[PDB]
Design a protein around this ligand. Structure first.
Ligand SMILES: *Cc1cc2c(cc1C)nc1c(=O)[nH]c(=O)nc-1n2C[C@H](O)[C@H](O)[C@H](O)COP(=O)(O)OP(=O)(O)OC[C@H]1O[C@@H](n2cnc3c(N)ncnc32)[C@H](O)[C@@H]1O
Ligand SMILES: [K+]
Lengths: 79, 542
């Protein structure tokens, strides 16, 4: 369950700053099986994870498009 | 210790390692090929990347762009096998973001080969060498905690660059030098490590890289005064707002635009910011209509990491460390001093890049030399016989012990902090321009840091710790950092990416330094330098 820390190291420097500190500062905050999208979304291509964060498109399973909102907004209230 | 008997093991599943693995499956269809990566390969740094009308014009621009430190026979090979490897990639499905398209095609092509057994999310800790010949490695399985012996008679290092050794950096945190480290542990020198290449527009704090297209589409670089200062540094007259010309001003030679930043720094002309000194890449004059069509991602990019809407204010940028020309020393077959052990891709020094990588030769090296390294290593897996079983197994056991002595090590130093001071010392002492005093300060700090490294605390975050792997990376970073710094300090000339301010060493010196810098590491922990000649064939120095 601390191996999702390792599903946070990405090839793009951009996702290290967008995914690794959001997993650190929060994650253990709003959990249950709403973390059912966190792990589900990490199993996606790096460009898609960069893009669906820059809103150059939207993920299909809109259960995962909600999680892209929670990572954008919770990070837009971070630093 | 589970074990897996392969013909070849490939450490690295990026552009170079994958291409190597396909090459070995196609060369010997009966082979067991272990393809190992600490990340799902589609997360290798190669995903992040975004004339040749003449073999001569390409061979000339590589050698000269590398300031005559290129292995010319390697260059001749490279230039001539570029068209083949581009063709082969398009056939494989690549439609004609180029590093993703490349890696995706290599990755999908690798799935057709049952010869290629992937070891996803496996961290390689050491290679096994006895009687001057590699005999396999030992890796940790992240997703489970266990350790695997993998025995092969050729091992191809494809671990990527040594970037995240600077505190501000364009590479994923992945790219920690692990393969260069492992070569050093076994007495293979790192070559030409002093030649690190900066990209001129990177975001402060992050190192996230602002594309050249920002300036291709007419964005300007100004200092605190809003002056387009590039005109003061030999970069032709100021071109009109909205009509850039290539090679002039913001489209000027990439090395001169970094150097310009530095001069503007020394002049008092930068802007002091949290986590750096910056200039401004200004895009306000484009307009969101232009900014949305071309350069669409760049807006959210700036909102996200520098909190700027580029339509309303300019973007803070500064030169960031980017590409490492040096790496594991290899011959024209990508084979290291240790027989059977190869290196290819950014982790290596095949002699293609000299003192400065030229354009997209970085991506093409992956498939040209990934193919060659793959073929060559197959060849050498078929002719190595066998090895003194007790020694190999003894060595594999020594990794096990070394790894447990490491856990609950006697000490109280913090690897995070040790890591950042190495990063700071790299920026200060091995940046755009070097001086014998800023290099010696940093050579010292590293020496101080590697002593503290001997006493870092791996706390019981338990199976096997993430903290323990980040520490093994740091070690690897530390050793390659000294190699850089020691080589820079010792290279008393200015060549390509390596530029010195001090008297004696401002000019390129072909009479004394037309030589490679080989950086060894002795068991005692100290850094030894040596030099080799530079294969000149067609093009003697200017
Ligand atoms: C960082 C970067 C580089 C880059 C670029 C943009 C960025 C942000 N844009 C480029 C461009 O537009 N054009 C170009 O020609 N080059 C560009 N670059 C440079 C280029 O992308 C890289 O030099 C190149 O991709 C290097 O690829 P290589 O195949 O050599 O290696 P890698 O992609 O970095 O992957 C290395 C693999 O090794 C595995 N690994 C590393 N250490 C270990 C350990 N210890 N154990 C197991 N596996 C390991 C990694 O998982 C990875 O797969
Ligand atoms: K290299």
């Amino acid at each position: 369950k601390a191996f999702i820390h390792w599903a946070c190291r990405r090839g793009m420097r951009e996702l290290d700053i967008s995914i690794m500190p959001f997993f650190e500062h929060e994650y253990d905050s709003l959990s249950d099986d709403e973390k059912r999208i966190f792990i589900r979304l990490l199993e996606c291509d790096d460009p898609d994870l960069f893009n669906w964060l820059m809103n150059h498109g939207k993920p299909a399973d809109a259960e995962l498009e909600m999680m892209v909102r929670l990572i954008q907004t919770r990070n837009r209230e971070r630093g | 210790m589970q074990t897996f008997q392969a013909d070849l093991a490939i450490v690295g599943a990026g552009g170079a390692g994958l291409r190597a693995a396909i090459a070995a499956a196609q060369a010997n269809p009966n082979a067991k090929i272990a393809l190992i990566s600490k990340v799902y390969p589609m997360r290798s740094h190669t995903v992040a990347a975004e004339d040749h009308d003449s073999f001569e014009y390409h061979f000339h621009d590589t050698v000269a762009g590398g300031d005559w430190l290129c292995e010319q026979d390697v260059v001749d090979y490279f230039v001539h096998h570029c068209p083949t490897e581009m063709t082969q990639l398009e056939l494989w499905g690549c439609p004609w973001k180029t590093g993703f398209h490349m890696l995706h095609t290599l990755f999908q092509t690798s799935l057709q080969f049952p010869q290629i057994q992937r070891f996803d999310e496996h961290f390689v800790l050491d290679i096994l060498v006895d009687d001057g010949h590699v005999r396999g490695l030992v890796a940790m399985n992240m997703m489970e905690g266990t350790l695997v012996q993998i025995r092969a008679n050729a091992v191809v290092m494809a671990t990527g660059g040594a970037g995240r050794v600077y505190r501000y950096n364009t590479n994923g945190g992945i790219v920690t030098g692990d393969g260069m480290g492992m070569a050093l542990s076994h007495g293979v020198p790192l070559r030409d490590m002093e030649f690190v290449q900066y990209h001129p527009t990177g975001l402060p704090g992050s190192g996230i890289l602002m594309t050249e297209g920002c300036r291709g589409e007419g964005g300007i670089l100004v200092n605190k005064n809003g002056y387009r200062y590039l005109q003061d540094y030999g970069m032709g007259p100021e071109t009109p707002l909205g009509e850039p010309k290539n090679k002039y001003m913001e489209l000027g030679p990439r090395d001169k635009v970094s150097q310009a930043f530095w001069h503007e720094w020394r002049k008092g002309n930068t802007i002091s910011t949290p986590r750096g000194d910056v200039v401004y890449l200004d895009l306000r004059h484009l307009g969101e209509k232009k900014l949305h069509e071309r350069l669409p991602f760049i807006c959210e990019l700036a909102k996200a990491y520098v909190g700027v809407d580029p339509v309303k204010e300019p973007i803070p940028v500064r030169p960031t460390a980017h590409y490492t020309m040096g790496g594991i020393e290899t011959d024209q077959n990508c084979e290291t001093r240790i027989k059977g052990l190869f290196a290819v891709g950014e982790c290596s020094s095949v002699g293609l890049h000299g003192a400065n990588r030229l354009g997209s030769n970085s991506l093409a090296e992956l498939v040209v030399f990934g193919r060659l390294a793959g073929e060559q290593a197959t060849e050498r897996a078929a002719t190595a016989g066998n090895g003194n079983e007790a020694a190999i197994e003894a060595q594999a056991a020594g990794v096990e012990q070394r790894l447990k002595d490491l856990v609950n090590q006697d000490g109280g130093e913090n690897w995070a902090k040790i890591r950042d001071e190495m990063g700071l010392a790299m920026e200060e002492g091995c940046g755009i321009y070097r001086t014998p005093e800023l290099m010696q300060k940093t050579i010292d700090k590293l020496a101080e840091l590697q002593e503290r490294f001997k006493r870092v605390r791996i706390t019981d975050t338990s199976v096997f710790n993430t903290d323990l792997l980040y520490t093994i990376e740091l070690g690897h970073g530390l050793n390659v950092a000294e190699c850089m710094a020691h080589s820079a300090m010792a290279r008393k000339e200015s060549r390509g990416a390596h530029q010195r301010l001090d008297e004696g060493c401002t000019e390129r010196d072909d009479v004394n330094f037309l030589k490679h810098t080989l950086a060894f590491r002795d068991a005692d922990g100290t850094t030894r330098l040596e030099y080799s000649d530079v294969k000149i064939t067609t093009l003697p120095p200017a």
